[PDB]
């Protein structure tokens, strides 16, 4: 019969390999008709200075517009003729491109990546159009609530840190950019080792590698001007931002604390703690006193409308915390439960709750990986963050080691008596003053 003693082992391992220019290729055969090659560049929004904040984001916008090999209309016509779904996204730390097509179509896609990697066309008129497209896109994203709130959360948490500025860049800075700044950004940031090719599904590794040699091998490897990035273990401020606009239907806030980095064991236990805190929404029929204790707190006298726990880890730091919508009159109460739950995990952590959290964590980490895109992105994100891969067997071997005492030690270590970053997009007014929150970070009974 099927069991974890067997079932964990049958998921195929990726085969890592190194090109002479230091680009690393990774692939995972999965007996699938379809596969998704991509390039998970380690460039992010934190690497820009204030002078050139919008370069990387801008590149993502105009990447598919044009290339030296062909006008971008031909490129899109080709990707569409193949039935391929090209896609791209950027992050404060991890930029990424990837393509989505059949394995039969696989080689034809891969060369295109190199094209898109090695020589995007940069027509000045195309830049001129993409500028106003961004300027409209900004106000189009202004309609969003949550994104604005995490943006305040980063701007609050880090302030003077390079990590703090938004990926989109300032609305003022965006029009000040020029093509030479973009090309300088290209030459100074896009190069192997930092490049990482990856694929999963129907791809055979050696085909992908032998093919990668013919296109990605043109990428420079020795640094131009011998430039080297200078990362720092950046500081975490305890500040808060509190935007208003009282006419908005709902308060919308996020609270966060310093977290263990993108490469530490402790994160795992924190995930379990998050699993204890539990997400909820009023749309769910599983409300009332049922479900997670914070989720149980969301509905009894009907507190939180909707919320979630999060841990946005970075290579240098991270952000443990919570995120919730509020009625104007309940913003205090929704807080009093939340911090209490943290306090409840700082002590009084029963083994069964930790077990349930481990189960939810296992189910999450396994359920996430279904499909080709999640595992390619996992390879793409994972290689950069950790190197290696992280086979699931390692994960559950590690999760089993987790204990309620461990959760108490670590949650007491990174949450108890801290000085949280706080963000609040209005109509806040009942939200407690920062001393009330900071006081609410520690019990006197303990």
């Amino acid at each position: 019969t099927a069991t974890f003693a067997q079932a964990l082992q049958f998921v195929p391992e990726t085969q890592v390999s190194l090109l002479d220019n230091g680009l690393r290729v990774a692939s995972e055969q999965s007996s699938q008709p379809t596969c998704t090659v991509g390039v998970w560049i380690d460039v992010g929004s934190r690497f820009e200075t204030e002078k050139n904040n919008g370069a990387g984001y801008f590149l993502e916008h105009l990447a598919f517009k044009g290339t030296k090999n062909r006008p971008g209309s031909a490129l899109e016509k080709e990707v569409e003729s193949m039935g391929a779904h090209l896609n791209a996204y950027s992050t404060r730390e991890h930029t990424a491109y990837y393509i989505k097509a059949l394995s039969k179509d696989l080689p034809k896609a891969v060369e295109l990546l190199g094209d898109i990697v090695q020589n995007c066309s940069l027509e000045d008129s195309q830049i001129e159009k993409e500028r106003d497209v961004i300027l409209r896109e900004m106000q189009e994203n202004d309609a969003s609530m949550r994104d604005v709130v995490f943006n305040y959360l980063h701007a609050t948490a880090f302030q003077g840190t390079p990590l703090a500025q938004a990926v989109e860049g300032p609305s003022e800075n965006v029009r000040k950019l020029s093509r030479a700044d973009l090309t300088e950004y290209l030459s100074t940031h896009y190069k192997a080792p930092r490049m990482v090719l990856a694929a999963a599904g129907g791809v055979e590794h050696q085909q992908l590698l032998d093919l990668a040699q013919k296109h990605l091998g043109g990428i420079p490897w020795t640094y131009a001007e011998d430039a080297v990035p200078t990362l720092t273990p950046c500081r975490f401020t305890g500040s808060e931002i509190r935007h208003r606009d009282d006419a908005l239907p709902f308060a919308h806030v996020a609270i966060a604390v310093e977290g263990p980095g993108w490469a530490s064991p402790d994160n795992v236990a924190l995930q379990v703690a998050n699993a204890i805190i539990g997400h909820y929404d009023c749309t769910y029929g599983g409300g009332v006193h049922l479900s997670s204790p914070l989720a149980s707190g969301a509905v009894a006298n009907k507190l939180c409308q909707s919320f979630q726990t999060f841990s946005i880890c970075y290579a240098e730091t991270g952000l443990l915390g919570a995120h919730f919508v509020c009625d104007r009159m309940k913003i205090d109460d929704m807080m009093f439960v939340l911090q209490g739950q943290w306090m409840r995990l700082c002590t009084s952590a029963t083994e069964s709750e930790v077990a349930r959290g481990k189960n939810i964590l296992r189910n999450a980490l396994v359920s996430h990986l279904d499909g080709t895109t999640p595992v390619c992105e996992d390879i793409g994100r994972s290689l950069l963050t950790y190197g290696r891969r992280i086979p699931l067997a390692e994960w559950e071997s590690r999760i089993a080691e987790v204990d309620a005492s461990v959760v108490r030690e670590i949650c007491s270590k990174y949450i108890y008596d801290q000085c949280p970053a706080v963000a609040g997009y209005g109509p806040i007014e009942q939200l407690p003053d920062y001393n009330r929150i900071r006081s609410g970070m520690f019990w006197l009974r303990f």
Binding site: V11, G72, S73, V79, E80, S81, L102, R362
Partner: protein, 419 residues
């Protein structure tokens, strides 16, 4: 390395399995019952019944269901549509013996204590509202209401006047009459087949065969309009289409993908689609235009859907529609057709590629006949399609009677007859 083991049972229950070695076992149960089987007497019952999944039952208290499913770390879910209703649950391989027992308790023996139902009555408005946060839905549920006299016209979501008046007795009456075992089909995955032979055998003791099975859903040509203050008017117009299993239906699919049903390139203007390339040269850039194709056992629907500036609306849908007229003229190269056929092959393989949507596929076609149809065979079925069949499909669209639904300022949108 195994084909799914499709199997029928003397009870009339259908069963299937497809062994894998991914640790998340993920089973589904598919009842043929849907919103269409509702009539005027008990309309909106399905929308609550999908939310009654966590209520207490004869064999288990609701606290036991919720706390059990959560303590296991697995999760139940309830997909629903105008055709099928689809319970589903995900869990680790060693835990199924618990969770599936909940499923057996949810569908076969669901007592509805009335106060618990009354407690869930208010929630229907919230779920309906968050569902109506998405602009296309609010048009298209009105579109089905504008396109059918009868069965398919019935909304997935509860009507506002029924939010407080749904009763447990109507729930039972919908349950015994539509959760017939003959209608049911069970689809496992990582779970081994023989233990499914056991647990399904546990399902066999309940319920006789054949459901109430009424209605036919006649077509109609009526309009529905809303008139709002929103600048972004958005609307769809639709002709009748043969569905399904016909080469003609495949011709409508290949047709919508000639028209470009959706983007393949993020953050990129759709250079190849005829509709985007018609409207873009017709007016301002802010719009979105694409073909739509409903597909139901009694009947299918086909037609353009659009979002646009309120002033430009009559400039938009009078343009894209003309594009279809060009196909009626026989103006169609083989090449872009090959590109479209490739778009269906790639897109279908993509939608299948996820395990959950795969289970939706197997559970969708398990009921129509149950004989599983491998994707390569579907590729044979699309490769079979000729250009002339496509021209016949567009010809049926242009020559057919049309319905329309709309939502926005509506100052400039054409009425359905003029279209």
């Amino acid at each position: 390395p195994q084909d799914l083991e499709f199997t029928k049972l003397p009870n009339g229950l259908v069963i299937a399995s497809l062994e894998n070695y991914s640790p998340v076992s993920r089973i589904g149960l598919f009842i043929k019952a849907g919103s269409r089987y509702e009539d005027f007497s008990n309309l909106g019952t399905t929308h609550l019944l999908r939310l009654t999944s966590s209520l207490t039952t004869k064999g288990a208290s609701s606290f036991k269901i919720t706390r059990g499913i959560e303590a296991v770390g697995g999760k139940l879910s309830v997909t629903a549509t105008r055709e099928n209703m689809a319970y589903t649950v995900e869990c680790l391989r060693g835990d199924v013996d618990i969770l599936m027992e909940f499923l057996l308790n949810v569908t076969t023996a669901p007592e509805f204590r009335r106060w618990e139902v009354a407690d869930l009555q208010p929630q229907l408005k919230i779920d309906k509202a968050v569902a109506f946060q998405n602009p296309q839905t609010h048009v298209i549920e009105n579109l089905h209401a504008a396109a059918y006299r009868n069965a398919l016209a019935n909304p997935l979501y509860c009507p506002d006047y029924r939010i407080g008046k749904v009763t447990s007795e109507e729930l039972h009456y919908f349950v015994q009459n539509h959760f017939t075992s003959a209608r049911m089909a069970l689809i496992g995955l990582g779970v081994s087949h023989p233990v499914l032979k056991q647990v399904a055998e546990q399902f066999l003791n309940m319920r006789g065969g054949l459901g109430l099975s009424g209605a036919k859903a006649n077509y109609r040509g009526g309009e529905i309009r809303e008139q709002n203050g929103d600048s972004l008017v958005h609307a769809a117009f639709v002709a009748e289409s043969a569905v399904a299993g016909s080469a003609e239906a495949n011709a409508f699919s290949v047709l919508q993908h000639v028209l470009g049903a959706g983007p393949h390139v993020k953050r990129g203007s759709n250079t190849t689609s005829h509709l985007h390339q018609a409207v873009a040269k017709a007016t301002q850039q802010p719009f979105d235009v694409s073909a739509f194709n409903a597909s139901y056992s009694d009947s299918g629907l086909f037609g353009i859907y659009t979002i646009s500036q309120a002033t430009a609306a009559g400039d938009v849908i009078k343009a894209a529609y003309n594009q279809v007229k060009t196909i009626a003229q026989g103006n169609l190269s083989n090449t872009d057709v090959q590109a479209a056929k490739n778009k269906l092959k790639a897109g279908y393989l993509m939608s299948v590629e996820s395990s959950e949507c795969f289970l939706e596929e197997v559970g969708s076609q398990a009921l129509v006949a149950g004989s599983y149809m491998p994707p390569s065979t579907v590729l044979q079925q699309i490769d079979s399609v000729a250009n002339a069949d496509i021209i016949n499909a567009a010809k049926k669209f242009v020559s057919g009677q049309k319905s329309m639904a709309a939502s926005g300022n509506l100052g400039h949108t054409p009425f359905v007859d003029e279209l």
